[PDB]
Amino acid sequence: PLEYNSALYSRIFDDFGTHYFTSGSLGGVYDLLYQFSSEELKNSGLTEE
Amino acid sequence: FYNSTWSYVKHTSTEHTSSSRKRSFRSSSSSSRSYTSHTNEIHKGKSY
């Protein structure tokens, strides 16, 4: 609309966003996390009478 | 995961001996006993 209406104009930001890229970098991202844990109990009791 | 393992031996041996003799006559008595109690236990629990 030519007259101002906050709703209808706000739908422009909903659909297309507030900004655009003037410049930038494209590429890729790798992220990893690994978490090993281990435990070992041994028992060797001997008793004699 | 975890891997529980248990290995239990109980061995008991018990012995009794009683020899007696009396004379004046002759008399004698011998008694002998051997007892054993044994338990072997193995228990395991493995979970993943």
Swiss-Prot record, chain A:
Q: How is it modified after translation?
A: All cysteine residues are assumed to be cross-linked to one another. Individual modules containing an even number of conserved cysteine residues are supposed to have disulfide linkages only within the same module.
What subcellular locations does the record give? Secreted; Target cell membrane
Tell me the domain of life: Eukaryota
Q: Which residues are glycosylated?
A: 47
What family does the entry list?
Belongs to the complement C6/C7/C8/C9 family.
Subunit-structure text? Component of the membrane attack complex (MAC), composed of complement C5b, C6, C7, C8A, C8B, C8G and multiple copies of the pore-forming subunit C9.
What functional role does this protein have?
Component of the membrane attack complex (MAC), a multiprotein complex activated by the complement cascade, which inserts into a target cell membrane and forms a pore, leading to target cell membrane rupture and cell lysis. The MAC is initiated by proteolytic cleavage of C5 into complement C5b in response to the classical, alternative, lectin and GZMK complement pathways. The complement pathways consist in a cascade of proteins that leads to phagocytosis and breakdown of pathogens and signaling that strengthens the adaptive immune system.
Noted disease: Complement component 6 deficiency: A rare defect of the complement classical pathway associated with susceptibility to severe recurrent infections, predominantly by Neisseria gonorrhoeae or Neisseria meningitidis.
Output this protein's name.
Complement component C6
Parent sequence residues shown: 346 to 394 of 934
UniProtKB/Swiss-Prot annotation, chain B:
Region entry Disordered, spans: 20-40
Q: Where does this protein have coiled-coil stretches?
A: none
Q: How is it modified after translation?
A: C-, N- and O-glycosylated. O-glycosylated with core 1 or possibly core 8 glycans.
Residue spans of biased composition, Low complexity class: 25-34
The protein's location, in the record's own words, is:
Secreted; Target cell membrane
Q: How does it assemble?
A: Monomer or dimer; as a C5b-7 complex it can also form multimeric rosettes. Component of the membrane attack complex (MAC), composed of complement C5b, C6, C7, C8A, C8B, C8G and multiple copies of the pore-forming subunit C9.
State the disease link.
Answer: Complement component 7 deficiency: A rare defect of the complement classical pathway associated with susceptibility to severe recurrent infections, predominantly by Neisseria gonorrhoeae or Neisseria meningitidis.
Q: What is this protein called?
A: Complement component C7
Q: Which organism is it from?
A: Homo sapiens
Q: Which residues of the full protein are shown?
A: 200 to 248 of 843
